[PDB]
Design an enzyme around this catalytic site. Structure first.
Site, PDB file in Angstrom:
ATOM      1  N   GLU A   1     -24.370  42.591  -0.503  1.00  0.00           N
ATOM      2  CA  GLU A   1     -23.444  42.242   0.569  1.00  0.00           C
ATOM      3  C   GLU A   1     -22.002  42.608   0.232  1.00  0.00           C
ATOM      4  OE1 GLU A   1     -26.385  40.338   0.741  1.00  0.00           O
ATOM      5  OE2 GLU A   1     -26.581  41.262   2.723  1.00  0.00           O
TER       6      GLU A   1
ATOM      7  N   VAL B   1     -24.410  50.140  -5.293  1.00  0.00           N
ATOM      8  CA  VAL B   1     -24.553  51.000  -6.459  1.00  0.00           C
ATOM      9  C   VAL B   1     -24.851  52.403  -5.958  1.00  0.00           C
ATOM     10  CG1 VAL B   1     -25.800  51.437  -8.598  1.00  0.00           C
ATOM     11  CG2 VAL B   1     -25.366  49.072  -7.844  1.00  0.00           C
TER      12      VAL B   1
ATOM     13  N   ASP C   1     -31.914  36.875 -18.140  1.00  0.00           N
ATOM     14  CA  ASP C   1     -32.664  37.466 -17.037  1.00  0.00           C
ATOM     15  C   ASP C   1     -33.397  38.703 -17.519  1.00  0.00           C
ATOM     16  OD1 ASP C   1     -33.666  37.601 -14.437  1.00  0.00           O
ATOM     17  OD2 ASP C   1     -31.864  38.597 -13.649  1.00  0.00           O
TER      18      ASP C   1
ATOM     19  N   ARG D   1     -37.480  44.528 -14.322  1.00  0.00           N
ATOM     20  CA  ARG D   1     -36.550  44.935 -13.271  1.00  0.00           C
ATOM     21  C   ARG D   1     -35.132  45.153 -13.791  1.00  0.00           C
ATOM     22  NH1 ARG D   1     -37.967  39.888 -12.526  1.00  0.00           N
ATOM     23  NH2 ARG D   1     -36.344  38.285 -12.925  1.00  0.00           N
ATOM     24  N   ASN D   2     -34.786  44.588 -14.955  1.00  0.00           N
ATOM     25  CA  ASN D   2     -33.457  44.760 -15.534  1.00  0.00           C
ATOM     26  C   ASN D   2     -33.417  45.728 -16.717  1.00  0.00           C
ATOM     27  OD1 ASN D   2     -31.955  43.242 -13.701  1.00  0.00           O
ATOM     28  ND2 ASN D   2     -32.566  41.326 -14.713  1.00  0.00           N
TER      29      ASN D   2
ATOM     30  N   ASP E   1     -27.684  44.772 -16.621  1.00  0.00           N
ATOM     31  CA  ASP E   1     -27.421  43.547 -15.863  1.00  0.00           C
ATOM     32  C   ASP E   1     -26.744  42.491 -16.725  1.00  0.00           C
ATOM     33  OD1 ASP E   1     -27.201  41.698 -13.866  1.00  0.00           O
ATOM     34  OD2 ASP E   1     -29.346  41.267 -13.701  1.00  0.00           O
TER      35      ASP E   1
HETATM   36  C1  LIG Z   1     -22.577  51.301 -12.366  1.00  0.00           C
HETATM   37  O1  LIG Z   1     -22.514  49.896 -12.609  1.00  0.00           O
HETATM   38  C2  LIG Z   1     -23.761  49.333 -12.725  1.00  0.00           C
HETATM   39  C3  LIG Z   1     -24.960  49.984 -12.381  1.00  0.00           C
HETATM   40  C4  LIG Z   1     -26.191  49.316 -12.535  1.00  0.00           C
HETATM   41  N1  LIG Z   1     -27.430  49.885 -12.294  1.00  0.00           N
HETATM   42  C5  LIG Z   1     -27.761  51.127 -12.786  1.00  0.00           C
HETATM   43  C6  LIG Z   1     -27.227  51.613 -13.991  1.00  0.00           C
HETATM   44  C7  LIG Z   1     -26.365  50.854 -14.830  1.00  0.00           C
HETATM   45  N2  LIG Z   1     -25.685  50.229 -15.415  1.00  0.00           N
HETATM   46  C8  LIG Z   1     -27.584  52.879 -14.430  1.00  0.00           C
HETATM   47  N3  LIG Z   1     -28.466  53.664 -13.703  1.00  0.00           N
HETATM   48  C9  LIG Z   1     -29.004  53.209 -12.551  1.00  0.00           C
HETATM   49  C10 LIG Z   1     -29.889  54.045 -11.871  1.00  0.00           C
HETATM   50  C11 LIG Z   1     -30.441  53.588 -10.689  1.00  0.00           C
HETATM   51  O2  LIG Z   1     -31.327  54.301  -9.939  1.00  0.00           O
HETATM   52  C12 LIG Z   1     -31.516  55.660 -10.353  1.00  0.00           C
HETATM   53  C13 LIG Z   1     -32.383  56.328  -9.278  1.00  0.00           C
HETATM   54  C14 LIG Z   1     -33.838  55.983  -9.550  1.00  0.00           C
HETATM   55  N4  LIG Z   1     -34.741  56.550  -8.532  1.00  0.00           N
HETATM   56  C15 LIG Z   1     -34.742  55.673  -7.350  1.00  0.00           C
HETATM   57  C16 LIG Z   1     -35.783  56.119  -6.340  1.00  0.00           C
HETATM   58  N5  LIG Z   1     -37.118  56.119  -6.958  1.00  0.00           N
HETATM   59  C17 LIG Z   1     -38.135  56.509  -5.969  1.00  0.00           C
HETATM   60  C18 LIG Z   1     -37.125  57.039  -8.103  1.00  0.00           C
HETATM   61  C19 LIG Z   1     -36.090  56.591  -9.124  1.00  0.00           C
HETATM   62  C20 LIG Z   1     -30.121  52.334 -10.195  1.00  0.00           C
HETATM   63  O3  LIG Z   1     -30.741  52.017  -9.013  1.00  0.00           O
HETATM   64  C21 LIG Z   1     -30.310  50.789  -8.419  1.00  0.00           C
HETATM   65  C22 LIG Z   1     -29.239  51.491 -10.867  1.00  0.00           C
HETATM   66  C23 LIG Z   1     -28.667  51.932 -12.065  1.00  0.00           C
HETATM   67  C24 LIG Z   1     -26.157  48.006 -13.036  1.00  0.00           C
HETATM   68 CL1  LIG Z   1     -27.603  47.075 -13.294  1.00  0.00          CL
HETATM   69  C25 LIG Z   1     -24.964  47.365 -13.347  1.00  0.00           C
HETATM   70  C26 LIG Z   1     -23.760  48.029 -13.189  1.00  0.00           C
HETATM   71 CL2  LIG Z   1     -22.236  47.257 -13.583  1.00  0.00          CL
END
Ligand SMILES: COc1cc(Nc2c(C#N)cnc3cc(OCCCN4CCN(C)CC4)c(OC)cc23)c(Cl)cc1Cl
Length: 284
Positions: free
Chosen positions: A20, A24, A131, A135-136, A149
């Site tokens: 909300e 990302v 956590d 998923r994290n 996370d």
């Molecule tokens: C930048 O700031 C932050 C970013 C994050 N989160 C991520 C970080 C980190 N860190 C790094 N890399 C990430 C990559 C992600 O997806 C990549 C695409 C995958 N495909 C999606 C579609 N399917 C079918 C195939 C695979 C992603 O997805 C939501 C979140 C990521 C966090 Cl948790 C906290 C903070 Cl502060």
């Protein structure tokens, strides 16, 4: 605190996660490398600003292969942004569910070793995750698993798996549920659940049992059954992570050591725990 990146160095390209109060994105960073970009939209509260920049502040304190690397922050322009390394394969739970059966046992155990090494580092840095769950964990194109996370209250507040305290019940150790005692030893319990998630390719722990049913089962001494095709040593290790008595659980130091020995003697992983089938199929 941490590198301040100018907005002209950052290009947001595609929404990959949403909330909300920000999104990302996948994007590019030209100080030209891919990055994840998390935004905080204007109108945020003081608490939101402290929680948001606190995630980056915490990540900036860490330097470890299995912990997400912070590239920097945009804080002197709006919307504010956190910029991290990009994990091409995303969250480990969705990744395994989408790739069911596609990895070797050695690869799966190697993922667990990486997660455990990151968690050992966090625990020794006096950081309790609270956590820990597949998923994290994020996965890159080298199959490296990294803990993600970070923050204080924002971690459990933002996770929809965490329900009313506010806690993701079936990943959480009994003492954390019962009296709010979150420690590296409760993270070890969660790591045991992560081991089960990895070895099952992302099965949901405890299936359709309700939260109360899970807590009742755990308190009565039941534990998750062995995954299919799971090395006996891996099932023994996850079971020890689920000791009711905190002091009897392995430390992350023990977990890393055990997983490293199994990987370095990989024939030790060919001995499988017996799988108790739920279905009887009989042919004459
Ligand atoms: C930048 O700031 C932050 C970013 C994050 N989160 C991520 C970080 C980190 N860190 C790094 N890399 C990430 C990559 C992600 O997806 C990549 C695409 C995958 N495909 C999606 C579609 N399917 C079918 C195939 C695979 C992603 O997805 C939501 C979140 C990521 C966090 Cl948790 C906290 C903070 Cl502060």
């Amino acid at each position: 605190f941490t590198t301040e990146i100018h907005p002209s160095c950052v290009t947001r390209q595609k929404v990959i996660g949403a909330g909300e109060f920000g999104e990302v994105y996948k994007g590019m960073l030209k100080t030209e490398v891919p990055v994840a970009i998390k935004t905080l939209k204007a109108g945020y509260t003081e608490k939101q600003r402290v929680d948001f920049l606190g995630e980056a502040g915490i990540m900036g304190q860490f330097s470890h292969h299995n912990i997400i690397r912070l590239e920097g922050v945009i804080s002197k322009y709006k919307p504010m942004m956190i910029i991290t390394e990009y994990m091409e394969n995303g969250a480990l739970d969705k990744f395994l569910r989408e790739k069911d059966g596609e990895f070797s046992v050695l690869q799966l155990v190697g993922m667990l070793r990486g997660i455990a090494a990151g968690m050992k580092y966090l625990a020794n840095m006096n950081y309790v995750h609270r956590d820990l769950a597949a998923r994290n964990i994020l996965v890159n194109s080298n199959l490296v698993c990294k803990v993600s996370d970070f923050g204080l209250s924002r971690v459990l507040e933002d996770d929809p798996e965490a329900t009313y305290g506010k806690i993701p019940i079936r990943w959480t150790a009994p003492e954390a549920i019962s009296y709010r005692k979150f420690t590296s030893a409760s993270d070890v319990w969660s790591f045991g659940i992560v081991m089960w998630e990895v070895m099952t390719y992302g099965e949901r722990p405890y299936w359709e049992l309700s939260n109360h049913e899970v807590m009742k089962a755990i308190n009565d001494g039941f534990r998750l059954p062995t995954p299919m095709d799971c090395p006996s040593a891996i099932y023994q290790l996850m079971m020890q992570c689920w000791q009711q008595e905190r002091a009897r659980r392995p430390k992350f130091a023990d977990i890393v050591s055990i997983l490293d020995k199994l990987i370095r003697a990989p024939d030790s992983l060919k001995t499988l725990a017996d799988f108790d089938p739920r279905v009887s199929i009989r042919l004459p």
